[PDB]
Curated annotation (Swiss-Prot), chain A:
Organism: Homo sapiens
Domain writeup: Dynein heavy chains probably consist of an N-terminal stem (which binds cargo and interacts with other dynein components), and the head or motor domain. The motor contains six tandemly-linked AAA domains in the head, which form a ring. A stalk-like structure (formed by two of the coiled coil domains) protrudes between AAA 4 and AAA 5 and terminates in a microtubule-binding site. A seventh domain may also contribute to this ring; it is not clear whether the N-terminus or the C-terminus forms this extra domain.
UniProt family annotation: Belongs to the dynein heavy chain family.
Illness: Charcot-Marie-Tooth disease, axonal, type 2O: An axonal form of Charcot-Marie-Tooth disease, a disorder of the peripheral nervous system, characterized by progressive weakness and atrophy, initially of the peroneal muscles and later of the distal muscles of the arms. Charcot-Marie-Tooth disease is classified in two main groups on the basis of electrophysiologic properties and histopathology: primary peripheral demyelinating neuropathies (designated CMT1 when they are dominantly inherited) and primary peripheral axonal neuropathies (CMT2).
Localization in the cell: Cytoplasm, Cytoskeleton
Role summary: Cytoplasmic dynein 1 acts as a motor for the intracellular retrograde motility of vesicles and organelles along microtubules. Dynein has ATPase activity; the force-producing power stroke is thought to occur on release of ADP. Plays a role in mitotic spindle assembly and metaphase plate congression.
Protein name (record): Cytoplasmic dynein 1 heavy chain 1
Gene this protein is translated from: DYNC1H1
Residues of the full protein shown: 594 to 659 of 4646
Superkingdom field: Eukaryota
Swiss-Prot record, chains B, C:
Coiled coil: none
Record-given protein name: Dynein light chain roadblock-type 1
Lineage, broadest ranks: Eukaryota, Metazoa, Chordata, Craniata, Vertebrata
Organism: Homo sapiens
Gene Ontology, cellular component aspect: centrosome; ciliary tip; cilium; cytoplasm; cytoplasmic dynein complex; dynein complex; membrane; microtubule
Subunit structure: Homodimer. The cytoplasmic dynein 1 complex consists of two catalytic heavy chains (HCs) and a number of non-catalytic subunits presented by intermediate chains (ICs), light intermediate chains (LICs) and light chains (LCs); the composition seems to vary in respect to the IC, LIC and LC composition. The heavy chain homodimer serves as a scaffold for the probable homodimeric assembly of the respective non-catalytic subunits. The ICs and LICs bind directly to the HC dimer and the LCs assemble on the IC dimer. Interacts with DYNLRB2. Interacts with DYNC1I1 and DYNC1I2.
Entry's family note: Belongs to the GAMAD family.
Swiss-Prot record, chain E:
Swiss-Prot/TrEMBL keywords: Acetylation, Cytoplasm, Cytoskeleton, Disease variant, Dynein, Host-virus interaction, Intellectual disability, Microtubule, Motor protein, Phosphoprotein, Repeat, Transport, WD repeat
UniProt source species: Homo sapiens (Human)
Designated name of the protein: Cytoplasmic dynein 1 intermediate chain 2
Gene Ontology cellular-component annotations: centrosome; cytoplasm; cytoplasmic dynein complex; cytosol; dynein complex; microtubule; vesicle
Residues represented out of the complete protein: 208 to 621 of 638
WD repeats: 57-106, 110-150, 159-200, 209-249, 254-299, 302-342, 348-387
Function: Acts as one of several non-catalytic accessory components of the cytoplasmic dynein 1 complex that are thought to be involved in linking dynein to cargos and to adapter proteins that regulate dynein function. Cytoplasmic dynein 1 acts as a motor for the intracellular retrograde motility of vesicles and organelles along microtubules. The intermediate chains mediate the binding of dynein to dynactin via its 150 kDa component (p150-glued) DCTN1. Involved in membrane-transport, such as Golgi apparatus, late endosomes and lysosomes.
Pathological association: Neurodevelopmental disorder with microcephaly and structural brain anomalies: An autosomal recessive neurodevelopmental disorder characterized by global developmental delay, severe intellectual disability, microcephaly, dysmorphic facial features, and cerebral malformations including simplification of cerebral gyration, agenesis of the corpus callosum, and brainstem and white matter hypoplasia.
Name of the gene encoding the protein in the UniProt record: DYNC1I2
Lineage: Eukaryota, Metazoa, Chordata, Craniata, Vertebrata
Amino acid sequence: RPHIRGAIREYQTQLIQRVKDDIESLHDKFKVQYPQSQACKMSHVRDLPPVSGSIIWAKQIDRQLT
Amino acid sequence: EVEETLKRLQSQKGVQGIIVVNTEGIPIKSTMDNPTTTQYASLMHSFILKARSTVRDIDPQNDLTFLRIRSKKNEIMVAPDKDYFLIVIQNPT
Amino acid sequence: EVEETLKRLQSQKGVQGIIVVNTEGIPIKSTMDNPTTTQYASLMHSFILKARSTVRDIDPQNDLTFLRIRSKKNEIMVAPDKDYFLIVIQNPT
Amino acid sequence: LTEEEKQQILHSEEFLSFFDHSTRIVERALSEQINIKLSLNRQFFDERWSKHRVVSCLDWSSQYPELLVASYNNNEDAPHEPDGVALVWNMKYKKTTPEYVFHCQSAVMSATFAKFHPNLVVGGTYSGQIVLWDNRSNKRTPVQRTPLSAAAHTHPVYCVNVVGTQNAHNLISISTDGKICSWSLDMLSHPQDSMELVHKQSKAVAVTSMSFPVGDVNNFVVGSEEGSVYTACRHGSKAGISEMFEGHQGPITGIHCHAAVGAVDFSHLFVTSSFDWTVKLWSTKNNKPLYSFEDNAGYVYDVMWSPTHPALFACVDGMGRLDLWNLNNDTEVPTASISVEGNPALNRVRWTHSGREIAVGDSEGQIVIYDVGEQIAVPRNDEWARFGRTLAEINAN
Amino acid sequence: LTEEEKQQILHSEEFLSFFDHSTRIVERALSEQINIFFDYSGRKLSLNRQFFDERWSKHRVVSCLDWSSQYPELLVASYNNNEDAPHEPDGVALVWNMKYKKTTPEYVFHCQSAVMSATFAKFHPNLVVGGTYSGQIVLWDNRSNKRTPVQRTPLSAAAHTHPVYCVNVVGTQNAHNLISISTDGKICSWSLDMLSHPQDSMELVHKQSKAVAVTSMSFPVGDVNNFVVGSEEGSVYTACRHGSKAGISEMFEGHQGPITGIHCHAAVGAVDFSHLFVTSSFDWTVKLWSTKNNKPLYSFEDNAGYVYDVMWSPTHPALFACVDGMGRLDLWNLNNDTEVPTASISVEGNPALNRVRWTHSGREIAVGDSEGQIVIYDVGEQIAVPRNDEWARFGRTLAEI
């Protein structure tokens, strides 16, 4: 509804940009490869090697992006 | 009739305490206790003595007439009379 | 703008001189006869020390803000701050 | 001891509040103690800032009275002096010098305060730039500025006013062009919403004078350059120019909606003031110049309605004559009318936000405070509504 | 002696004329009544230790930490063998002394296998034990002329098949039950003296022969034979040491990821029943659960790096200490904080914090870095706050929806 849109811009700008920065953080998170991440090393410590741990990392970024 | 002005100054806006110095740094008329009236007024008596010494050192013909101090928690006017002096304690608001 | 402050507050009548002294006692602001008023600046430096000792010893929490003095011949005030201080001398005009 | 050390410490980042409280407390000691119907209360002037510096606006401080923005224009006589000057003056203090000074860079126009901001002073300029001023700041300098965006106000700003509650308050400036811009009250480099008042013919309507009905509707009356007083919603399907009120012979110079409930029900009315030489009464729902006023000789510039009495207002002229007007009594004459020394062709009239006193924004230089005390709000609620009904009927011919 | 009679001079008619002059001054001075204008005037960590040894803590990887109730301020910094010392015996366990403030190991408990979560032994401080990667559990004894384990577990069917991720003590010296949780869906409640055949070798497997792989599931404080179960894929439970609930009997699921640490409530200062168990996992949140939720009561916050551990403060009953894989320590209380941390900072550089264990003496978090150095931190100011029933209010309101 246009009244609410004319007043929705207030929140809309900051909220959309906040989620945008969150998606940008997710971008920067997946720019680096999995073995260069510390999640790979501690997963490897928890018997989650760089192949079967990379799926947890990828699905984790998937969960946060979704 | 100082007592009627005293009675007017009871519920006046901001009155913290109503005393006077009586014997040149030794006050007697006290609506408060021994330190707040007598010791604090004797301190201020020595302090206005130092201030009269200051202005007398500027010019010995130039004595002092009236004093007032404002601060955070109180506003105190000091009227130096001839032998005894005067202290009136009051709120800033 | 400090000279603008000097002009604008010396244009206020009664004032014979805006002679403002610092915490150091140094004539950081003087417009009158400086060997005469530097003695008086050192005096009121010592007696601003007296007044701050007065405030911080009579009361723990109180802060000295400002001072009102009526002399015999003129009307002189003292403006202390937390870091530095002020002196100016004015006549009844 | 040495001049180098002094000009260090003087220009250091320590003496800022020291000089501020020094000037403030020494000016605070200016009130002399002693040891022995229009008020014409007090003139407010300064030759260091006001001489050929006509006033631009005036507005009392909603929060903290005895503070009103003395926004001015700056003559190019001393071009080196800052173009645009906005000051504040005081009543509770009672001195000669103004409260503050604010250097600017362009001719300050329509500068006011900022609601929910006890220390933020916004101001429109002739450059189209919009500045801001702060009390916790420590300069004469605009604390912020606005860019000159393609959608921003390039044209001079004539009516800047805060709009909204403290959870959501905007600030809207308007150029001459017609674009209106929404602003954030913290940052200032970016227009929040910057639409444009557009009409089918002459899209960029040359607006002037906005005012709002108290209740913060997204509708605001807008004084056109030639009558044509349009009022318009801020958004919805009526983002720009929405309704047309016209039938005015000249340039609209001042506008104002109804103040709060004096006695009567809100009375959704507003007024104009123009170069037609007459003030016209107008309601929000008529498309009709409801009731015109007196043909005072010369132009009529500003107009303000008292926040106290629901039916009394004031205006100015080219003669320097506050011709205030109540309407419960009069119908064709001013109720009380006083003049000023000489004939300074005045430019601002301001009822005080506090009510029952009035600031006349004098034109050349000074600011003269007036006051009244016999005009109050007796419960003439329907008696005033009766008067409004008399107008609604006698104009029917 | 100030005066024989104070009253007569002041009671007089002419000394009060000087007082009338003074009250004339008073009437002259009180008439002004002007006040000053405002014009917008206006007017926890401690870095306890660091464990760097030239032979047993050379940038290793901490398996898990454990704070002994008996002889407090001591932690077995179970350092799994890193690549810095391959020839040295794997899973280096070392007792420490917070009371001594040392950087040199007090005793060495090294083993031939990759020891995981070498915890203490209640009423046996020097007889340190530890579960391994091989599926066996090893019991060391520094005072047995063998820093190598003196009581090794054979890798037969009695022991565990998959790696033993969490060995932990249950009960005092009378019932020294040592539950060794493995990633086989089988745990073994050992003893602290003999470590050959398991005393209570129950199985945390489902109805099928699946490998219910745990991810170092911790234990509730008190050892009331009820232990929380956290597998490598949610599977947030509360299994019993005996009876029919010695498996996957109960079910509080709806969780994603390996529950790295499932810690219940710490020492009750002014809170409720103290049974709420949160779940630090790979889902970048520490979801809260209880014995009646069967839902993630309240999910915590994490955005970079997996939460590898959680432990709650025994001093302040409503606050805890959770981690990430970067260094943040979002320590905050449920009664006063929604999800924002009361104190949080990334550890020096960026270490993937594997462990955080609150010291048994009080409010000191054994922040286990990725490096084989347990840089412990004391929250200080965050002491026990009374009337902490808002913790229960927060938990109930979040348990509702």
